[PDB]
Amino acid sequence: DWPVYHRIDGPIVMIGFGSIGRGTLPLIERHFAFDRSKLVVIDPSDEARKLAEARGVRFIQQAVTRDNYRELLVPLLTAGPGQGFCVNLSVDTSSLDIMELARENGALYIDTVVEPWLKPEARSFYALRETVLAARRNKPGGTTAVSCCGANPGMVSWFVKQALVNLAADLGVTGEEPTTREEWARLAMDLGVKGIHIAERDTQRASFPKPFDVFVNTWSVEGFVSEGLQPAELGWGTFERWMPDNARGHDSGCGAGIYLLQPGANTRVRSWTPTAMAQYGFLVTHNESISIADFLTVRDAAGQAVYRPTCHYAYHPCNDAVLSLHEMFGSGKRQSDWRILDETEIVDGIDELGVLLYGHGKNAYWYGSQLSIEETRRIAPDQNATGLQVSSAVLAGMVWALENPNAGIVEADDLDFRRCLEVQTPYLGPVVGVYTDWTPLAGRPGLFPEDIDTSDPWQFRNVLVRD
């Protein structure tokens, strides 16, 4: 008795049918009523074609490009009878161009990342996010288009809101539950949240040993590698007193971010999750690092920022992905082959994904999901635990967009977090909040001299591994 939330009265166009598309389609078929013959999947690959053929859904085997996207998508988006829904789960395509095409033709839109069509300041996820904010300022309101609504970016934005609420109660901080951005930002400031890690540990383990010269991951290899080779990026908090010599800022935009002139997936930070305890994460650039820091910014009269939390990814991927990164960076080039772990090839593990709020009176608080592969297989087909946290987030954003179809261009930080979590929670396994006394200065200084800041344990000076 799965809930059928709404009818979709027009076409459903899924761009891309990889690990996430394969996990999202069965949720779309499960939770929405629609004209089955109006669903169409667009993907250039033959692996995708035969999978889509098995489910008997329309398949167009093409790569969407700058040259063909208009003539290819417009007739599909406007086929009626009612409002269609564009579900973009691809690599190598312009999120912004397809988003704007969907809007000007009255189709709803959702994606999980801002990327361009197939100089570090440009190409950064900060600049790409800025193109979306600019589009929203150019065409306020209108048809809803949800930008970056997967597990992270996406779900973690809702975890941050629930975490702040939990910290307010546990810290005896009194007041209404915020309902505006300005009020959320001030609540973060009042609780004394210096920064936030997106703190993730994937423990899914494969049934086969790691093959030589093969990159292995639990989701897009092409996407992860592309993101990991880009400069490390973070939302930059007002409490930070030090940045590295190779750090750089942005001349325009919301002003919430810096980047480092080194690749994110070869940049380690000291972080913590409940199952891993103290661990290394990689500082891989991500939309929510900027969007969450921007969302929680408090400005004064003259528009200057007086409070902003640090925010960045601290990603420990699966063991095979750690080995794949060691191999790739040590060889100096991409492996000649890659594979994504299928649920049939995973013997055990979880995708532990949450937000670690630190700097407040209880030191540090981690809130998020501990979804296991065994739980995943029980409640959803064709995906591993990583995929289901992403695919269920897309499902939640689609429900929200159907109930709020004229909200304009919106980020995950703009959605009603309680409604989105109500949709997603049946697919998240244990969702828990845990306090810890761990700090980045645990056990330090040790035998060797280090350039640490002992006045404040959570300074980025102390978090960043400086090899």
Ligand X SMILES: NC(=O)c1ccc[n+]([C@@H]2O[C@H](COP(=O)([O-])OP(=O)(O)OC[C@H]3O[C@@H](n4cnc5c(N)ncnc54)[C@H](O)[C@@H]3O)[C@@H](O)[C@H]2O)c1
Return residues touching ligand X (CB under 6 A): 15-21, 42-45, 48, 63-65, 89-93, 112-113, 115, 150-154, 219-220, 222-223, 340, 390
Smallest gap from Cβ 323 to a second copy, in A, equals 6
Task: Please say which residue, 303 or 332, places its beta carbon nearer to a second copy.
Answer: 332
Judge if the upstream peptide bond of residue 211 is cis by omega within 30 degrees of 0: no
Q: Which is nearer to ligand X, 51 or 269 (CB)?
A: 51
Q: Does 316 bind a second copy (CB under 8 A)?
A: yes
Q: Is 45 in the site for a second copy (CB under 8 A)?
A: no
CB of 50 to a second copy, least distance (A): 30
Is residue 203 a contact point for a second copy (CB under 8 A)?
Answer: yes
CB of 65 to ligand X, least distance (A): 6
**Amino acid found at 95:** S
Of ligand X, a second copy, none, which one sits near residue 316, judging by CB under 5 to 8 A according to partner kind? a second copy
Give the whole-angstrom CA distance, residue 229 versus residue 407. Answer: 34
Compute the least distance from the CB of residue 315 to ligand X, in Å: 11
Report, in angstroms and rounded to the nearest whole number, the Rg of the chain calculated over CA atoms: 21
121 is an interface residue for a second copy by CB under 8 A: no
2 lines the binding site for a second copy (CB under 8 A): no
**CB distance 82 to 214 below 8 Å:** no
Q: Choose the stretch contacting a second copy; rule: CB under 8 A; options: 66-74, 88-96, 249-257, 443-451.
A: 443-451
SS3 sequence of the chain: CCCCCEECCCCEEEECCCHHHHHHHHHHHHHEECCHHHEEEECCCHHHHHHHHHHCCEEECCCCCCCCHHHHHHHHHCCCCCCCEEEECCCCCCHHHHHHHHHHCCCEEEECCCCCCCCCCCCCHHHHHHHHHHHHHHCCCCCCEEECCECCCEHHHHHHHHHHHHHHHHCCCCCCCCCCHHHHHHHHHHHCCCEEEEEEEECCEECCCCCCCEEEECCCHHHHHHHHHCEEEEECCCCCCCCCCCEECCCCCCCCEEEEEEEHHHCEEEEEECCCEEEEEECCCCHHHHHHHHHCCEECCCCCEEECCEEEEEEECCHHHHHHHHHHHHHCCCCCEEEECCHHHEEECEEEEEEEEEEECCEEEEEEEEEEHHHHHHHCCCCCHHHHHHHHHHHHHHHHHHHCCCCCEEEHHHCCHHHHHHHHHHHCCCEEEEEECCCCCCCCCCCCCCCCCCCCCCCHHHHECCC
Q: How far is the CB of 466 from a second copy (least distance, A)?
A: 7
Q: Which residue is nearest to ligand X (CB)?
A: 18
251 is in the binding site of which of a second copy, ligand X, none (Cβ under 5 to 8 A by kind)?
none
- The distance of closest approach from Cβ of residue 94 to a second copy in the complex, given in angstroms and rounded to an integer, is 21
Q: Does residue number 212 form part of the binding site for a second copy (CB under 8 A)?
A: yes
As measured in angstroms, the least distance from the Cβ of 301 to ligand X is: 36
147 binds, among ligand X, a second copy, none (CB under 5 to 8 A by kind): none
Closest CA to 412 of 112, 191, 170: 112
Q: Which is nearer to ligand X, 37 or 45 (CB)?
A: 45
- Minimum distance from residue 452 beta carbon to a second copy (Å): 13
- Stretch 267-296: interaction string toward a second copy, x if CB under 8 A: xx-x------xxxx----------------
Phi/psi at 323 (5° precision): -65, -35
Among 333, 336, 344, 455, indicate the residue that binds a second copy (CB under 8 A). Answer: 333
* Residue 268 contacts which entry, a second copy, ligand X, none (Cβ below 5-8 A, type-dependent): a second copy
Q: In the set 104, 347, 426, 445, which binds a second copy (CB under 8 A)? A: 347
Position among 90, 124, 266, 384 found at the interface with a second copy (CB under 8 A): 266
Given the complex with a second copy, which of 120 and 408 has the nearer CB atom? 120
Q: Which does 19 bind (CB under 5 to 8 A by kind): a second copy, ligand X, none?
A: ligand X
The residues of the shown chain that bind a second copy, judged by CB under 8 A, are: 120, 203, 205-206, 209-210, 212, 229, 231, 246, 261-263, 266-268, 270, 277-280, 316, 319, 322-323, 326-327, 329-333, 347, 442-444, 446-449, 465-467
